[PDB]
Structures are given as C-alpha cells and as structure tokens.
Amino acid sequence: TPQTTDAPAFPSNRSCPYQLPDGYAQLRDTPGPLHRVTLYDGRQAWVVTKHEAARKLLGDPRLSSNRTDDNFPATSPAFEAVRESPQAFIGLDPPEHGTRRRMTISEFTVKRIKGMRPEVEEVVHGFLDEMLAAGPTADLVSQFALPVPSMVICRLLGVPYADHEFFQDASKRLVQSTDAQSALTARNDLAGYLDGLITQFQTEPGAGLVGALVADQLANGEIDREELISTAMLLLIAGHETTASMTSLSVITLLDHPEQYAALRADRSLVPGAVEELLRYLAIADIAGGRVATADIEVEGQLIRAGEGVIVVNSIANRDGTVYEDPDALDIHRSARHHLAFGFGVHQCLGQNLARLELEVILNALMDRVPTLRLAVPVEQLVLRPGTTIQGVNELPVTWHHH
C-alpha cells in the first residue's frame, strides 16, 4: 500500500550543514501553523512551522516546559536522563522559573558582558597563537572552537579549567548520547564532579557564579544542593556546546558563500549583522522547543488539547518567507531582527549576548590572523550530528598559508 502518512517521523537529520532537512522544508511549506509528527516512541506530536505562531506559542502560559511530565515530547531515548533528574530552571514554569533564573542573571547582563570583551579577546588569540604555531593541518573543533567558550564559561562559573579534559568529555558523551544508559552515565560523571566542587567551596569560598551560589543561596536553604548541580551543569554544557557549534558551522557556511565573506573581511561594521543572520540561518538548537499543553489552545482554527506535545522548531520558523525575504538565502546584509534561534518569552536564552560577543570576537580574530583559512576536506565528507541533539560537526580539518 502507499506509505504516505499525515504525521511524518520527527526529527530529520541535516545533510548540508546549513540547509533544512528535506522533511523540514516540507513542513515549512504546508499551510497552517501546526503539523502532526510521530516521535521515536510512536507517540504523535505537534510541531509549529510558522514564525508568528512560534512566537505566540512560546509566550503562551498554557505550554509547559516541565520535562518530568509523562506527555512531554521526548525526541530520543537519551532524553530520559534529563527527564528523571532534578530540573534546572529551563524545565521550570512561572513562578518557580523566575526565582531560580534570577540567581544567575547578574553575570549575564549587557553591562557585564560588554566589559568581558578584553578577556574574550585574550582567550581567542591565545588559542589561535597555539593553533597556528603547531601548523596545518588543524581540527578546528578540539583546538579552537571548543576550548575558547569552555575557558570563558569556566571563569564565569568558577569551574577550574585544569579539569577541562574531564568535563569536556562528559559533556560530549551527554549531548551526543544515543541510548539512555550512556546519557545517564555521562550525567552522573558530571554531577559527581560538581558535588565535590560544592563541598570544596563550602570549605573555601570560591570565585564565579557557583561559588557565590554555594556561599549564599545554598547556605540559606533557598536552593537544593542537587538543584545547584543541575543549574551549574546546564550553564556549563550550554556555555560550551552551543557557541562551539556556531563557530564550526558558521565557518563551514561562510566558506561556501565566499563573496559575503570577502565583504565581511572588508567592513568589520557588518560583523554584528552577520552574527544575527548566522544565528537565524543555522539555528543549531531546533530541539529546544519542547512543551506540553496544560490546557486546550486554539491556533488559527487548529486545536491543541491538554496533554499534547508541541515542538516549536525555531529552524523552520526562522525560514518563514513572510518575515525574511527569500528565507533559505544567507544574506549578511538582511535585517534578521525577531529571529527565534534564542527562543522567546520567559525562557529566552540567558546567554545570548555572551554568545553574540564570542562569535563577534572569534570571527574578527579568524579574519585578522588566518585570512587564508579554508577547509582541508570537501564539505561533502564531514560527518553531521543527527537531528536529535545540537547541530554541528564533530570534526573539522582546516588549513591555511603557513608562515
């Protein structure tokens, strides 16, 4: 019998790092803001496929971020690590979400982020220096794209960069984990590490956010010890994994559009605009749109019922032709305003301006010091991560003009 169904499987995997998976360009094109899909466990779910609708549902208080709910749309087995663990505030709803988030925000304001610019410039050129000096060829992942945000986020959290090999490895295993067993074991490695850091900080008040949370909120019983572990773990992995994939994918992508890059290299006033457009275009975290309805919601004559799962896929909504003229075209000159790569509403990405700062420093730095950077394999040979985790390559060999 024909095989066509009205709720395709979800998610799909990318095949060119900067293009929607075929199955996603479909859903984008169907009229209507909501489409049915089938998740890995045969349950059926709603995906939002339009910009204004995504924007409205992300602001709607009837869509919960509670991941311990049995109807939360888990997209992979690995997910049931985070489901059964104490929740960071990304899995909380108002009013709990606010009191937890408000403990971390002092370190992420525009004032604090702006003033970090000297220190971020120092880290980047530091790791380039070392990269360049060991000569081509280089894997831009392990030698640059990953170490740079790791170092920055550690100094912010107060995690010692000495232990960098341990937690980078445990973060890798946890984002890319394909089964539940591997994800839990990565989580328990990281949690056990962080629990010892907290005791160490109870003996000697540490620096960073984690030190301040130990010495203050934990000492007064306003946060559970195990909640602290989850919060620090969220910031640590998010601090690392996202900026690094942006760096690698923005590099693959900028090279396959060499006439916009040229113009980037020639007018550094455009860099903050190309950052926005890169964020819109690449949307590395389309999974981070998971919600469950706690009530019936009406959207343009379609009905989400209490208990249904809804995935706001910000990569599709960012390719909404009625907001971005020719949406599948990378245009560093376009106005990429109102994009959803960071989300919207109360869960809007806490670290977005740190992420903008890192990318804008990193790019300038790559254009000053390796203006002849190019890839050391053809793009068709890179292994892409699957659609069940954050978008990116795991390896990126590159080369340049040696001194």
| Piece in contact with ligand HEM (CB under 6 A), picked from 77-85, 117-125, 219-227, 348-356 | 348-356
When binding is defined by CB under 6 A, the residue of 74, 341, 363, 365 that contacts ligand HEM is 341
DSSP 58-119: HH-TTEE--TTSTTS---SGGGHHHHTSPPPGGG--TTHHHHHHTTTGGGSSHHHHHHTHHH
The contact pattern for ligand HEM, residues 136-175, with x = CB under 6 A and - = no contact, is ----------------------------------------
Token pair, residue 181, equals 């067993």
Nearest Cα to 126, choosing from 398, 361, 353, 356? Answer: 361
DSSP 354-375: HHHHHHHHHHHHHHHH-TT-EE
Q: Which neighbouring-strand residues pair with 398?
A: 138, 375
The contact pattern for ligand 114, residues 158-197, with x = CB under 6 A and - = no contact, is -----------------x----------------------
Binding flag, residue 89, ligand HEM (CB under 6 A): yes
| Piece in contact with ligand HEM (CB under 6 A), picked from 15-23, 38-46, 197-205, 242-250 | 242-250
With CB under 5 to 8 Å by kind, the binding choice for 241 among ligand 114, ligand HEM, none is ligand 114
Question: Is residue 401 a contact partner of residue 376, using CB atoms and an 8 Å limit?
Answer: no
Q: Which of 80/121 has CB closer to ligand 114?
A: 80
CA–CA dist 221, 194 (Å, integer): 18
Residue 270 DSSP code = G
Residue 76 C-beta: closest distance to ligand 114, Å = 6
- Is 177 labelled a binding residue? no
- Is 347 labelled a binding residue? yes
Alpha helices of 180-270 — where are they, by DSSP H? Answer: 180-203, 208-213, 225-255, 258-266
Question: What are the angstrom distances between the C-alpha of 141 and each of 144, 149, 329?
Answer: 6, 11, 26
Residue whose entry in the numeric block shows the structure tokens 């971005």: 324
Task: Please list every residue from 349 through 388 that binds ligand HEM, using CB under 6 A.
Answer: 349-351, 354-355
SS3 322: coil
Task: Please list every residue from 205 through 244 that binds ligand 114, using CB under 6 A.
Answer: 230, 233-234, 237-238, 241-242
When binding is defined by CB under 6 A, the residue of 113, 145, 264, 390 that contacts ligand 114 is 390
When binding is defined by CB under 6 A, the residue of 10, 24, 46, 79 that contacts ligand 114 is 79
CA–CA dist 201, 158 (Å, integer): 10
Task: Please list every residue from 275 through 294 that binds ligand 114, using CB under 6 A.
Answer: 285, 287-288
Q: Which of 177/248 has CB closer to ligand HEM?
A: 248
| Core vs surface per residue 321-360: b (16+ CB within 10 A) or e | eebbeebeebbbebebeebbbbbbebbebbbbbbbbbbbb
Query: What is the residue type of 358?
Result: E
Residue whose entry in the numeric block shows the structure tokens 């068709």: 380
Q: Residues annotated as binding site?
A: 75, 97, 101, 187, 230, 287, 291, 347, 349
Which residues are at the interface with ligand HEM (CB under 6 A)? 65, 89-90, 101, 234-235, 238-239, 242-243, 246, 284-285, 288, 314, 341-343, 347, 349-351, 354-355
Q: Residues annotated as binding site for calciol?
A: 75, 187, 230, 287
Q: Residues annotated as binding site for heme?
A: 97, 101, 291, 347, 349
Which residues are at the interface with ligand 114 (CB under 6 A)? 78-79, 82, 85, 88, 90, 175, 230, 233-234, 237-238, 241-242, 285, 287-288, 389-390
